[PDB]
Structures are given as C-alpha cells and as structure tokens.
C-alpha cells in the first residue's frame, strides 16, 4: 500500500531506527499497510519516484525536489518522534 523511503547518510542501525520511527508515526495516523525502505540521499534521486512518501534531512531535501511526485518530508532532526509526527501530519492531514 503506502511506500515510504527514508533517504539519509546515516549508518545502518540509525537508518533502521529512522524508518521504524517514521512507520510508527504513520500508524498513529491510521495508515495500516506500509512498505519502508532506506538508502542514501544520492541513491534516492534515482529511486524516489517509486515511493509515496520520501523522508530526508531538511538541509538536503532540495537535492530531491523534482525527483518524485510523492510527499517530500524534511526533518531538522531525523530521530525526533515529535517532529516526525508533526511533519507527517502537516503533509498528509
């Protein structure tokens, strides 16, 4: 159903934690069926068009503008559950 890409330069453990936190926020909004993936910002340029939602650092989302027709969501802090929830609400609600 909903495909979400986390595009960031973090290490493997951190990347999994961000995907999980994004997924949790989506489930709070009532989105039940979610496919989550992560890769680098440079890799996301070529892949972002496949995804409904693309999440990245606010400092880098300009690298992804025009690479997807989906919701591009920027975060000042990628681990902040409260900003995550706020930015997803703002994009989707």
The CATH number assigned to the domain holding 60 equals 3.40.50.2300
- Determine whether 8 is an active site residue: yes
Instruction: State the virtual CA torsion across 21, 25, 31, 33 in degrees, nearest 10.
Output: 10
What is the domain range of residue 54?
Answer: 1-93
How many domains are contained in the chain? 1
Give me the catalytic one of 8, 18, 55, 64: 8
**Residue 5 DSSP SS3:** strand
Resolution, angstroms, 1 dp: 2.0
Structure obtained using: X-ray
Residues 40, 53 contacting (CB under 8 angstroms): no
Provide the CA 64 distance to its chain's centre, in angstroms: 12
Residues 46, 13 contacting (CB under 8 angstroms): no
**Residue 3 DSSP SS3:** strand
Alpha helices in the chain (DSSP H): 12-28, 41-47, 81-92
Whole-number Cα distances in Å, 5 to 9, 30, 65: 13, 18, 14
């Amino acid at each position: 159903m909903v495909k979400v890409l986390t595009a960031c330069g973090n290490g493997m453990g951190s990347s999994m934690v961000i995907k999980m936190k994004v997924e949790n926020a989506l489930r709070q909004l009532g989105v039940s069926d979610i496919e989550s993936a992560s890769c680098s910002v440079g890799e996301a340029k070529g892949l972002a068009s496949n995804y409904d939602i693309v999440v990245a650092s606010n400092h880098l989302i300009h690298e992804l503008d025009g690479r997807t027709n989906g919701k591009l969501i920027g975060l000042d802090n990628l681990m902040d559950d409260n900003e995550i929830k706020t930015k997803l609400e703002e994009a989707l609600k």
